[PDB]
């Protein structure tokens, strides 16, 4: 039964904190998991947490009756940006359940059919950008994927056009958002956050948020200027009421949800698409098989909703990309009551767990020894995979609400990418994963050759 938990090097009162003195901390928690195993203790000033890495222990952690969602120190900081929005609010603090009930219809499958036409509107824009490049020019993949995913959630969700393909540098929203999220991640290393040395950081942050909120002001303003009726994510936000309480969303809260969905609805998807395209050019026979399916299925000028759902292997490319590098690399849980995990490590009420998603997906006692290798064929049969062995979208009633939204978009775009282009690893890119809480490959550049297949029109 019971045994004690391994713990990495400690540095006096700082405990394990100096170990995360890196701009790549998740990949460093991976270095440690490989050392100490399926579980280890991480202490910092005024916080302890247990990092899980095995399917064995994580299967237990996803028992909603034993464990509830925890706000990690990261999310506690992000809360300064997103407030008590869907992602950063407690399960029992329910402006959550209130918003959950109000918004969940916007991700009903009848709603997905509504978004598709708008998803193609942006997807066409991406393809046309690349089909209009000159032969000497490179494609900045994560940059352009971000343009695609921001504009999609912007249109589908709020009927607002960021028009990112009409812009040189990133949208002012993106610059503020990235910098503000970098602050939340970087603040995890400050032993004294309120030292006046970080006054410049506190000042930049309040201005970054000023910028993000003045965009939200635009979205709501343009909305009350009417556009006949709408039933997108923003409409249900303004007019929907929680059946349990008969109450609509607080004014302070509708703003937090817009911020939430603008951020949460695109950073991990562009990350996914950038990781997917990366793996394809590093495994050309996988790229071929995927491109062949793309050509075989997408026969009309623009993809139909049904056609996207027929791209099974393109879906497998995505899931495998999410396996090797889940772009939301971790989520937290707390013990509802006293209990014992894996019958070996006893936990007190309110103790904190971290599910290290990249290490879960490298569990050799689930996936084989060929963990690091990119084989989409693992997902050829969903029925096979044990539950809680694959968790890129979290768990339970607080798993990703936008999961179907992300995968439908990603498959659609990746579909059109393979139908319309060949891809050359122009720089022989060495994978350099950048962390802003989320994961994305930085500096990734490809070259595209057009297959010269015309495009049609757009429904929306
Ligand atoms: C590949 C893309 C995505 C990944 C990997 C991902 C991952 C996740 C994860 C792990 C969680 C749980 C967080 C936690 O347990 O602390 C989550 C929740 C959430 N996601 Fe996603 N997500 C993706 C795309 C999206 C999209 C497209 C949307 C669009 C709206 C979205 C909106 C949300 C929201 C609102 C929550 C919180 C829901 C709740 O807990 O009530 N995500 N996501
Ligand atoms: Ni025993
Ligand atoms: Ni070149
Ligand atoms: Ni061959």
mmCIF file of N, CA, C and O and ligand atoms in Angstrom, residues 135-138 424 426-427 445 447, ligand 3:
data_model
loop_
_atom_site.group_PDB
_atom_site.id
_atom_site.type_symbol
_atom_site.label_atom_id
_atom_site.label_comp_id
_atom_site.label_asym_id
_atom_site.label_seq_id
_atom_site.Cartn_x
_atom_site.Cartn_y
_atom_site.Cartn_z
ATOM 1 N N UNK A 135 7.596 33.523 -55.371
ATOM 2 C CA UNK A 135 8.378 32.293 -55.247
ATOM 3 C C UNK A 135 9.543 32.388 -54.255
ATOM 4 O O UNK A 135 10.074 31.367 -53.822
ATOM 5 N N UNK A 136 9.937 33.605 -53.895
ATOM 6 C CA UNK A 136 11.070 33.802 -52.989
ATOM 7 C C UNK A 136 10.644 33.876 -51.526
ATOM 8 O O UNK A 136 11.484 33.979 -50.628
ATOM 9 N N UNK A 137 9.339 33.812 -51.292
ATOM 10 C CA UNK A 137 8.786 34.103 -49.977
ATOM 11 C C UNK A 137 8.466 32.854 -49.161
ATOM 12 O O UNK A 137 7.993 31.847 -49.691
ATOM 13 N N UNK A 138 8.731 32.943 -47.862
ATOM 14 C CA UNK A 138 8.456 31.857 -46.931
ATOM 15 C C UNK A 138 7.080 32.024 -46.283
ATOM 16 O O UNK A 138 6.493 33.105 -46.313
ATOM 17 N N UNK A 424 7.351 22.156 -48.437
ATOM 18 C CA UNK A 424 8.790 21.941 -48.379
ATOM 19 C C UNK A 424 9.360 22.449 -47.059
ATOM 20 O O UNK A 424 9.141 23.600 -46.677
ATOM 21 N N UNK A 426 11.652 24.112 -45.920
ATOM 22 C CA UNK A 426 12.610 25.027 -46.546
ATOM 23 C C UNK A 426 13.860 25.308 -45.712
ATOM 24 O O UNK A 426 14.952 25.470 -46.259
ATOM 25 N N UNK A 427 13.707 25.366 -44.393
ATOM 26 C CA UNK A 427 14.826 25.713 -43.519
ATOM 27 C C UNK A 427 15.369 24.516 -42.737
ATOM 28 O O UNK A 427 16.279 24.672 -41.920
ATOM 29 N N UNK A 445 8.893 27.669 -40.269
ATOM 30 C CA UNK A 445 8.685 28.238 -41.589
ATOM 31 C C UNK A 445 8.681 27.149 -42.658
ATOM 32 O O UNK A 445 9.534 26.260 -42.658
ATOM 33 N N UNK A 447 7.566 26.309 -47.091
ATOM 34 C CA UNK A 447 7.342 26.861 -48.415
ATOM 35 C C UNK A 447 6.209 26.058 -49.036
ATOM 36 O O UNK A 447 6.155 24.834 -48.885
HETATM 37 NI NI1 LIG B 3 14.406 30.938 -48.530
#
